[PDB]
Enzyme design. Structure first.
Site, PDB file in Angstrom:
ATOM      1  NE  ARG B  91     -33.628 -41.194 -33.639  1.00  0.00           N
ATOM      2  CZ  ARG B  91     -32.932 -40.547 -34.576  1.00  0.00           C
ATOM      3  NH1 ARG B  91     -32.902 -39.216 -34.654  1.00  0.00           N
ATOM      4  NH2 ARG B  91     -32.236 -41.264 -35.463  1.00  0.00           N
ATOM      5  CG  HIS B 454     -23.797 -48.929 -39.729  1.00  0.00           C
ATOM      6  ND1 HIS B 454     -22.473 -49.362 -39.655  1.00  0.00           N
ATOM      7  CD2 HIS B 454     -23.980 -47.949 -38.776  1.00  0.00           C
ATOM      8  CE1 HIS B 454     -21.890 -48.620 -38.741  1.00  0.00           C
ATOM      9  NE2 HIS B 454     -22.763 -47.798 -38.161  1.00  0.00           N
ATOM     10  NE  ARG B 555      10.422 -32.802 -52.732  1.00  0.00           N
ATOM     11  CZ  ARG B 555       9.345 -33.186 -52.053  1.00  0.00           C
ATOM     12  NH1 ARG B 555       8.732 -32.334 -51.227  1.00  0.00           N
ATOM     13  NH2 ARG B 555       8.873 -34.432 -52.187  1.00  0.00           N
ATOM     14  NE  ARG B 611      13.189 -27.655 -50.028  1.00  0.00           N
ATOM     15  CZ  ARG B 611      13.123 -28.984 -50.044  1.00  0.00           C
ATOM     16  NH1 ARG B 611      14.011 -29.773 -50.655  1.00  0.00           N
ATOM     17  NH2 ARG B 611      12.113 -29.532 -49.382  1.00  0.00           N
ATOM     18  CD  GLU B 739      12.475 -25.972 -44.175  1.00  0.00           C
ATOM     19  OE1 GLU B 739      11.582 -26.764 -44.436  1.00  0.00           O
ATOM     20  OE2 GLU B 739      13.606 -25.908 -44.848  1.00  0.00           O
ATOM     21  N   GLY B 760       7.704 -23.697 -44.444  1.00  0.00           N
ATOM     22  CA  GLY B 760       7.825 -25.167 -44.341  1.00  0.00           C
ATOM     23  C   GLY B 760       7.162 -25.503 -43.003  1.00  0.00           C
ATOM     24  CB  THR B 761       3.618 -26.072 -42.245  1.00  0.00           C
ATOM     25  OG1 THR B 761       3.272 -26.623 -43.526  1.00  0.00           O
ATOM     26  CG2 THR B 761       3.554 -24.554 -42.272  1.00  0.00           C
ATOM     27  CG  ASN B 762       4.617 -32.223 -42.718  1.00  0.00           C
ATOM     28  OD1 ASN B 762       3.499 -31.866 -42.226  1.00  0.00           O
ATOM     29  ND2 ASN B 762       4.881 -33.483 -43.095  1.00  0.00           N
ATOM     30  CB  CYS B 825       5.809 -25.289 -49.516  1.00  0.00           C
ATOM     31  SG  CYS B 825       7.276 -25.300 -48.440  1.00  0.00           S
TER      32      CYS B 825
END
Lengths: 868, 868
Positions: B91, B454, B555, B611, B739, B760-762, B825
């Protein structure tokens, strides 16, 4: 001496004497504070006013004057001196804080000669006069000589015909006219008494009207229920005046260090510019939110805050103060750590520990133990609220989201069932003479008011909701109605919420981490166990939820009553022969086996006291002729044969007849059937789970030993005979209710056949008193009115009377049976006092209704915590 | 050497090598435990299997044999010796625990010769054979050579024609027939391979099938999402067998020290008598609740418990073990502190501290930071549930109360939108090859199973609900349906709940004192601030609720889009002339003034990043011809004139065109209108409350310095010109979104005109990667399949790539502007990793969606906590 004390010549410790008010003031005074010096007229002296006749005398008069002189000099002004006076404020300082219920006569020691004399001294007849019009309404009002209705009607109209936007613009002429027509408004309603123009006449006329109001109706009714005694007293701190009414640079404000609805650490409160403390902030003219005092007086704010703070800490608890900018000068008229809301009472403590301020210990004791009840009020259903016709909005004055029928009178309120019929109370503004309408309403709507207003402040402690300063409300009392938005409301179901809106389906509600860190700690410091008096596992679940350690009493009454068990005991009863009465009894056998199983399965190891049948047979037969026609037929008996049998069943006194243990003395088959169902269900359940279950079998109404010996000898043999599901190792203790006088009495003999003493306090009280909770209603209030009984005997533990029967029993049964557990089941089972008396009394477990458990947690926390 | 390790010749510390499994086992082994000795085949060696080709080699083979010999002697039996064998279990022991996803071949080293040889040695051909039929299904199954479907179909039928109540009564003949027809069931599905009869053939055939399965689909998909890397490995502890299948005094059980759904301190689990560990408890034959082991084996319970306990403590965390009574003998095959549910993960820790065990510190780090998300799942509405047609009940297998369309396939599940379309998954039993249907369903219904099954076990960690061992369910896959109670269900909306019942309106939900003592402590140990990226105060409220310190991004996009602001920018755009475009812009002026006011009024002092507009003009015009016909008319323009103008608005790439800061470079009027509304609303609101408000003005998409210099020079002059509500003292900092690559790049110059770097990361990720979150969908999965990208680049912070752009910026802008605040953000803003990377990265504040805040609390708690 020491009838009266000086602020500086006192402390806060001296509470018994200097109230929460008078002692906290001096306290500040000992710290050094913007408090105009003065003096407090001590508590002992208040009670002395009564412990003598009902009117002031010597040393007191002496001292009010002996020290009023110390002021004068100390203050250089002259008390009621017609030239260049000396004004004073006169306000009530009892022990316990009592927002909404006090008396404070403003600007006192003023007259037609001395107003004018102030007028000239004060370079401002608008001021001193406005003050004098002020004193005219107050003095009277307090000392009740006029219904505000009046003063109000003359001030109001006065401006309300001249044009004047508001009182703040009325002149020295108009004012003096006001306070001119005011003496006569006092006159007309009186038989011709000079509105006490002699300062040695306003004063005593009030100090006495302080030391004498207390013993009146509303105060008795409030102070009772508020867990206060009349054995205490009213105080009256007298001090010099400060005038937030001087003009447009002098203001009067209400404030709190941390938001008292939510808990929110931060300045919270209402202020007014050129307003008079004890009157305008608490009603009439939308009061500037204390924070705006930065935009308004950005030299002041700093005062107050670092001062608030300073104090916030000086006490280590959410302060509440009366500050006054008596013309660009800050003054702290009053303090006291205000009474909170249930959550905020919580918040603040979690926080205060978080902030290092209190200790886990302190925090606990510091909660208003009986206040937990709020935490578990029916919240509003989200999906309904949205489905709720918004009509208005206003003020988050006190958390809650209530609803119900609409009333415009507290007396129309109260006279419409307590806080559950669902009584709304729409009211222009509330008053000390509304205090009973306050206590029987779900929530309140107030036209004029704020966080600081009369109603608001009171709701908070009442845990009752409230939306103050709720404008646009054209309410007409005559036609018993009111407006809002675009609606016409005739006394019927309305909906208010702690979230502004004045709308609804309710529901069960959260318990933040407060309840948790408060409950967590309770368990830590508390010693008595907790259990719930339950019957339905549904509550067993919901109760275990609340930190319930099991069951203190489990009722079997339904286990017959219930929809399908019904005509099987009704059988047995209308059945002459044990073999019939056994047959019958043998049929419910299965049924209750389930009941128990559910419970057990719910309880998982948690104890569970199973009380034996209680009600007599009579409770178990249709009192109707209808159900009687039924019953008969199905029995092959005559409608006449049943009645007759339903006749031999009549007790002159159902409480003291053939029931409980005596009942299974001539039908030990009840014992039999009862033993077995409990016995098999526990056995089988102890099987199908591998979990342990030790039946706690309870014989109620045991008068004496030998008796219970009878029933135990039965129950035992069957419980030993039930163990046919294996020679068994099944556990069981046979205990009894110490609910009768003889039984509490010979307790020391009683505990011979018994392991556990289970106290029935509502039933014991009813014995030890002489009355029944049922009947007594038709005279109880009198005992209240007449101040004979202070607390409710069915709610609050008679520790002078009943507390004895319970203490002879605990400590005598523990003479014969040391390892004797004792637990309390009566309604007083979860009672911030009881659960302290029971704690110091020697009890082991506790037992309250499912929801009063959390009150039982804290209670037992408090109980030992603070005990020693 | 050291390719493989010995239990005794290891520790728990050695995890990187000995997994959670192999190291904990030895750990026990170092403590002394009823664990049959053995060995673990180390992690490095697993990866070595791949870092070479894909098949075992030398030192390894060597060692599996070098040490398998140590066993044999040490165990006196002979490995696969046809006479008096030696069986073993095989296992998977990876680092991180992985209930539901592993591989464990039972009774290995058995054959037709050696079974019989065991048969005689074991005085019981029913045993060793049953074991041999066992090994036949397993080995294969694991090493996938057959779909259980088969084995199952032959075992099942085998009894399911003879009569046999259940497998436990099949004989030595019938069994041996089973495991006879089993080799051929393995045969048929294969091309003729001898079911690995050579023990030096079953073994390697598996150890490799362990060290090789990992890199397969489901494991990649699970292990990915589970925040595990393929850079780690599979382990495989081999040890001697113990047989809970010997007979009727030997049993196989699953257990946990504290209830893992609720948190409940106490033994929780499922056991079987004469059953085989890794197979029957986890499915087929209602498994005896561990507590019944007192009624069953009341000499055993003591073993296990004081042993469990012992261990419970030895680790200071909720244990989970594989115990086995291999014929009246206790054995602990396995351990690992099981993965919890969100609440219980909580409970246990509050408790564990309460119990002195963990520290406030430890408790915090110990939570599965990303698991908080569960706490805030839509609960069921009380008034609907009751209004819910009860049809069934079953198992409190995993807390939750879900609902939605019904699927019988995980692939029909998954292929029906993720966990929100509302996909139920009715399934006979679940499997490792259902793992993607698991992750996109609200809750699961399982016919056969329990707490240990399971599906159950997996739900828990997935935070997904589940009701296992839910009988009476005639589900037909062919006709894609299923039964229950008195119903016929065709793939559509069903309702399951953590409270047995399998029914509904949802709603917001509590947060016990756990969240509170966990959140409380987080704040204590954490340093980075927290804020929410909000837009609507409603969330501002609900977000502050969650321990939100303000707003990271606000926003304005809607502030135009919204129902009535709409055709006013649509004006301005279809408007050639600044004075028009200003007029237009001047009309929304009021509107957004409100927006801000609400926010502010909500926020009360709490910061708030505002922003500036983002979307290009194009986003702001009807793409329809319809709304175009509209628009036109109302503009006195031609439908043709707008289109044309709606044409010049076309970007080949909307992400990298004319938008954000560049947008207000040719329309600085946007800047103007935007500045002012924020500026006046804050000013007026800072008035009408006396409270303080310091506008945080955010310029998005700043590429370089000089640029932002342009826009700031605008915003500033208006914000300085807006201060016409008093020469003012109004505060404001003009910050920018880091960004874009150049902007992160010349950060050190960028921070000249800027106070605050807002990441701004996205949007940055999308630059720094090369793809867009939109497009990339049509190839992302491949990167997953192909193991190119491990984590989601839009969810999880690319710290090798993007993490640089963000770190050049923080530490360079802080070269020019030391007192430079930085806050995150992007979606990765509240990310148990991010919020650690951002923490150690130098950031100041945080910013996640309203609900991911609590994840941001813990995250930042963890972040610094465990950091150093």
């Amino acid at each position: 001496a020491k009838w009266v004390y000086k602020f500086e010549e006192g402390n806060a410790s001296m509470r018994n004497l200097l109230g929460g008010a008078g002692c906290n003031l001096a306290e500040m005074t000992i710290l050094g504070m913007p408090i105009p010096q003065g003096f407090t007229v001590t508590t002992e002296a208040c009670t002395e006013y009564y412990n003598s006749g009902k009117q002031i005398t010597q040393e007191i008069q002496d001292q009010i004057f002996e020290a009023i002189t110390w002021l004068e000099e100390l203050n250089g002004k002259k008390f009621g001196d017609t030239e260049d006076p000396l004004l004073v404020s006169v306000r009530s300082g009892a022990r316990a804080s009592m927002p909404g219920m006090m008396d404070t006569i403003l600007n006192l020691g003023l007259n037609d000669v001395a107003v004018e004399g102030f007028a000239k001294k004060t370079g401002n007849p608008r001021f001193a006069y406005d003050s004098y019009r002020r004193f005219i309404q107050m003095y009277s009002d307090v000392v009740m000589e006029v219904p505000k209705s009046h003063f109000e009607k003359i001030i109001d109209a006065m401006k309300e015909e001249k044009g004047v936007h508001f009182d703040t613009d009325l002149t020295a002429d108009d004012l003096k006219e006001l306070a001119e027509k005011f003496k006569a408004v006092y006159k007309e309603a009186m038989n011709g008494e000079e509105f006490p123009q002699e300062p040695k006449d306003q004063l005593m006329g009030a100090v006495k009207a302080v030391f004498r109001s207390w013993d009146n109706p509303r105060a008795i009714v409030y102070r009772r229920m508020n867990d206060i005694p009349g054995d205490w007293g009213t105080a009256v701190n007298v001090q010099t005046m400060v005038f937030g009414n001087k003009g447009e640079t002098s203001g009067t404000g209400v404030a709190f260090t941390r938001n008292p609805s939510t808990g929110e650490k931060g300045i919270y409160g209402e202020y007014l510019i050129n307003a008079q403390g004890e009157d305008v902030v608490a009603g009439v003219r939308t009061p500037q939110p204390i924070t705006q005092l930065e935009n308004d007086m950005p030299d002041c704010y700093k005062q107050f805050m670092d001062l608030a703070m300073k104090l916030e800490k000086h006490f280590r608890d959410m302060q509440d103060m009366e500050f006054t900018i008596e013309e660009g000068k800050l003054y702290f008229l009053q303090t006291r750590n205000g009474k909170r809301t249930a959550p905020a009472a919580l918040q603040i403590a979690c926080d205060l520990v978080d902030e290092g301020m209190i200790t886990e210990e302190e925090a606990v004791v510091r909660i208003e133990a009986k206040s937990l009840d709020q935490l578990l009020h029916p919240t509003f259903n989200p999906a309904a609220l949205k489905a709720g016709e918004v009509i208005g909005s206003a003020l988050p004055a006190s958390p809650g989201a209530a609803a119900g029928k609409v009333y415009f009178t507290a007396d129309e309120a109260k006279a419409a069932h307590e806080k559950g019929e669902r009584v709304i109370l729409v009211r222009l503004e509330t008053s000390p003479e509304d205090i009973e309408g306050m206590h029987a309403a779900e929530g309140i709507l107030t036209v004029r008011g704020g966080m600081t207003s009369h109603a608001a402040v009171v709701a908070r402690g009442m845990g009752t909701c409230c939306v103050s300063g709720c404008g646009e409300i054209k309410i007409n009392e005559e036609a018993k109605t009111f407006e809002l938005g675009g609606h016409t409301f005739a006394e019927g179901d309305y909906i208010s919420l702690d979230g502004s809106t004045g709308k609804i389906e309710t529901q069960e509600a959260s318990v933040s981490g407060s309840f948790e860190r408060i409950m967590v700690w309770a368990d830590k410091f508390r010693t008595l166990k907790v259990r719930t008096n339950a019957d339905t596992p549904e509550d067993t679940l919901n109760a275990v939820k609340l930190g319930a350690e099991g069951i203190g009493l489990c009722r079997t009454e339904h286990m017959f009553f219930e929809a399908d068990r019904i005509m099987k005991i009704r059988k047995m009863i209308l059945s002459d022969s044990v073999e019939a009465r056994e047959e019958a009894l043998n049929e419910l056998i299965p049924f209750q086996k389930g009941d128990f199983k559910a419970m057990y399965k719910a309880l998982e190891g948690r104890p569970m006291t199973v009380r034996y049948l209680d009600p007599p047979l009579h409770e178990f037969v249709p009192h109707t002729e209808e159900e009687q026609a039924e019953l008969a037929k199905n029995m092959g008996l005559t409608l006449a044969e049943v009645k007759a049998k339903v006749d031999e069943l009549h007790e002159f006194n159902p409480m003291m007849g053939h029931r409980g243990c005596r009942l299974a003395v001539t039908y030990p088959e009840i014992a039999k059937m009862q033993t077995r169902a409990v016995m098999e269900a526990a056995i089988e359940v102890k099987e199908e789970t591998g979990i342990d279950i030790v039946p706690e079998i309870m014989i109620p109404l045991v008068g004496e030993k030998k008796e219970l010996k009878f029933v135990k000898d039965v129950v035992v043999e069957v419980a030993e005979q039930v163990k046919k599901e294996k020679g068994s190792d099944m556990q069981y203790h046979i205990g009894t209710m110490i609910e009768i006088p003889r039984a509490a009495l010979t307790a020391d003999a009683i505990a011979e056949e018994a392991e556990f003493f289970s106290f029935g306090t509502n039933d014991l009280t009813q014995m030890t008193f002489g009355f029944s909770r049922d009947d007594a209603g038709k005279f109880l209030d009198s005992y209240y009115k007449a101040k004979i009984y202070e607390s409710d005997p069915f709610a609050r533990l008679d520790q002078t009377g009943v507390g004895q029967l319970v203490e002879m029993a605990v400590k005598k049964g523990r003479q014969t049976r040391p390892g004797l557990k004792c637990g309390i089941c009566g309604e007083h089972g979860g009672d911030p006092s009881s659960v302290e008396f029971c704690h110091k009394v020697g009890l082991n477990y506790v037992s309250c209704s499912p929801f009063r458990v959390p009150i039982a947690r804290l209670a037992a926390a408090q109980a030992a915590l603070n005990n020693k």
